[PDB]
Amino acid sequence: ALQTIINARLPGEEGLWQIHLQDGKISAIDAQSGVMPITENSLDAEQGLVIPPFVEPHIHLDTTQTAGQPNWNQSGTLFEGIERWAERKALLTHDDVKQRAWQTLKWQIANGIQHVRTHVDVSDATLTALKAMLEVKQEVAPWIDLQIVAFPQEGILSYPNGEALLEEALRLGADVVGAIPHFEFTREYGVESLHKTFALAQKYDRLIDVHCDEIDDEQSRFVETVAALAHHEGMGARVTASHTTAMHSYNGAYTSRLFRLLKMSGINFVANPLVNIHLQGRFDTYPKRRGITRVKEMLESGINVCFGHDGVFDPWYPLGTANMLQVLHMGLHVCQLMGYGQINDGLNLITHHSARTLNLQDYGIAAGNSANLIILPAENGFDALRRQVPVRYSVRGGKVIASTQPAQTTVYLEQPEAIDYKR
Amino acid sequence: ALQTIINARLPGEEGLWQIHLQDGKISAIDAQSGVMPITENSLDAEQGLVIPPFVEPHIHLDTTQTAGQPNWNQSGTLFEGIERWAERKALLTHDDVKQRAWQTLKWQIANGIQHVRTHVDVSDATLTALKAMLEVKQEVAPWIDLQIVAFPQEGILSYPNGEALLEEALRLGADVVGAIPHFEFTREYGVESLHKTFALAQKYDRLIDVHCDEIDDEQSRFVETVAALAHHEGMGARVTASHTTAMHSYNGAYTSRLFRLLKMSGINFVANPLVNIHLQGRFDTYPKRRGITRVKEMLESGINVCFGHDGVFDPWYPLGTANMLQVLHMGLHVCQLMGYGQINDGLNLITHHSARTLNLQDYGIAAGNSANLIILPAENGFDALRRQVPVRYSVRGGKVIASTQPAQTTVYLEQPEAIDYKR
Ligand SMILES: O=C1NC=C(F)[C@H](O)N1
Ligand SMILES: O=C1NC=C(F)[C@H](O)N1
Ligand SMILES: [Fe+3]
Ligand SMILES: [Fe+3]
Helix, strand or coil, X not given: CCCEEEEEECCCCXXXXXXXXECCEEEEEEEECCXXXXXXXXXXXXXXXXXXCEEEEEECCCCCXXXXXXXXXXXXXXXXXXXXXXXXXXXXXHHHHHHHHHHHHHHHHHCCEEXXXXXEECCCCCCHHHHHHXXXXXXXXXXXXXXXEEECCCCCCCCCCHHHHHHHHHHCCCCEECCCHHHCCCHHHHHHHHHHHHHHHHHHCCEEEEEECCCCCCCCCHHHHHHHHHHHHCCHHHEEEXXXXXXXXXXXXXXXXXXXXXXXXXXXXXXXXXXXXXHCCCCCCXXXXXXXXXXXXXXXXXXXXXXXXXXXXXXXXXXXXXXXXXXXXXXXXXXXXXXXXXXXXXXXXXXXXXXXXXXXXXXXXXXXXXCCEEEECCCCHHHXXXXXXXXXXXXXXCEEXXXXXXXXXXXXXXXXXXXXXXX | CCCEEEEEECCCCCCEEEEEEECCEEEEEEEECCCCCCCCCEXXXXXXXXXCCEEEEEECCCCCCCCCCCCCCCCCCHHHHHHHHHHHHCCCCHHHHHHHHHHXXXXXXXXXXXXXEEEEECCCCCCHHHHHHHHHHHHHCCCCEEEEEEECCCCCCCCXXXXXXXXXXXXXXXXXXXXXXXXXCCHHHHHHHHHHHHHHHHHHCXXXXXXXXXXXCCCCCHHHXXXXXHHHHCCHHHEEEEECXXXXXXXXXXXXXXXXXXXXXXXXXXXXXXXXHHHCCCCCCCCCECCCCCHHHHHHCCCCEEECCECCCECCECCCCCCHHHHHHHHHHHCCCCCHHHHHHHHHHHCHHHHHHCCCCCCCCCCCCECCEEEECCCCHHXXXXXXXXXXXXXXXXXXXXXXXXXEEEEECCCEEEECCCC
């Protein structure tokens, strides 16, 4: 088995590094003063970048691969998407869900993703998708640590037996309690639904991840209740507010007041660039707002924010290959995080910040941690992002679980020339 | 030499097709009723998509690869970009320009791009970059047909000897007359500069491509003068309005009135998604406008619109590998052209529509045309876009000028499995 990763570059560090492995864990990390020779049991990073695994903090594996079934989301809105999904949800079968979830999970393994948080719609008395996903979680465990969010897609108080079904999902083993306050019939139901969500999370000792204010409504401020309840309960690390796209439309004075609470609360934020740019701004004519939450300001304020893919060929998103560098690319452009350092540091949005969002306890290139790491054939985050590089090797427990032999491009000029798009 | 392209899918057509080649041209195109066997002199498209070459209708090869030299565009605005470029322009040398232009051109050849329109800043008494680019045009001719736009970056009337230098550039051989009305000191200089641009285009029988209303100013309406002058002169096919980002901010009533003229005029439009999403909206706080011109409405109205990359690692854009499918991906998201058919038809925005913008006379998979075509390892435009596929083969004059052996990804589950991200 592998004993060392050599010739590795690490974000924020100068030079090359060697990562020693023992019993499936990282035993030590030592700097190199030059290039080390390869040998059996040594995986050569070849002066590429070594980082802990990519993370998918927000995806819907129960809906993945169902776009157009039985109908397409014509308007490209969150609301029609939920209606189209309702039609598909009525046709779910156990094997259907497992097969589609596994198809996307394999793309994720290929893309160096070893941690995934999937929401699963539990506004369904049969809990068909949840039962299937709980089996998938066990089956995929050797390659991906899958967290399941009990997501009451049609509301907690606004759907028949919504609260009972949400609790049933937790009793069956869901890892995270979800909610969707802006979809509840009234603002009061929205606020009350959050009190119920927090009570369930404390009763069962589970994490929280709310689909929060995913709407271009400047009056949708459920995020302040999520943050205040987390602060009151002293549980910010365990709480996440997904989307918060309404924040894109808030006035600046309220946002400034709010940011103090967001920081004090310690809660996490997920932005979903590919889906947000598509679903938000649909009620504007021109000009049209971008609709992504205030990622740049969160980073400047030290508030933990990260990026998810959200949908992969489903009612809310017709594209995708479950590639986090592609998600990152979209987010950096739409959020205008286009300075060299902002782009280079972008990898944090799909690695460390996402691990914090998932409350991971064994993550990072550090002595004592499990030997879970990936190798990118690039010099730094900027280079990896610019060239949209594949994952050369994905290592888990000290063993290679995925590898990509890069494409080879040649142009035939006066003489053949290899093109790698580098400078 | 190659005699046939077999097993080809064609956009908008059912089944498979065979493209017969003779003397560097396409002699005939015949439908197949099944898969044809390979043989020597036959290039097998392997049921992939065959299309005429990708086109780059708007790039700046004189500024490519200079981002951060001598300083970075900190604000990420058009205006600071021009100031940073001015600093770099003072340091230009003949060989400097040729080397950087050739580096990006090689990436373009690798990416199946056989037609490129580069703007070159002629607000420079020495015309250093233009002289270098005229040599590059001749040198790259076997692989790319390069058009050069004499672009008066600092204005025609607002820069010393601007008009004389613009005309000098045409006398030296520039193919297209440029302008930048919104950067002129006054609205009157802007309008007058367009009369001068059209007079020069008619005097020298050249095309026109104006950097038009690239500003989030609802009062920047130079596009109506570009279209009206083209209509008056009966030369719409030879005229292009690049950017028109101000159109994103116009009221709908004026836009409706304007669209009648745009259609009647027959002029072309270029949108530059990667750069527009980055440079536009920089003066907004929140919400923030997207800033791309009205691409969706132009398509619905039958107005020719297409996409350019604009910058590749320069003062206005820190990223890029000169990849048109990546440009297309950004445009489809920001413009909300996310319906299945809209995405599938997206290839037109980087092939046929761009060829029309460049007034190309030998373009398309048709009998009698030069055998210039590329093969994408994908089933249709949607698939090519979703998976961001490379160009498997680029053929020019019936000869292969570029090829890419695709990457090979494997996941090691209970058994090794190849992953191609297809369904
Ligand atoms: O409520 C939602 N359901 C599914 C989505 F993809 C979107 O994140 N929002
Ligand atoms: O005026 C401009 N110069 C260069 C650019 F990249 C931008 O297209 N606009
Ligand atoms: Fe979601
Ligand atoms: Fe330009």
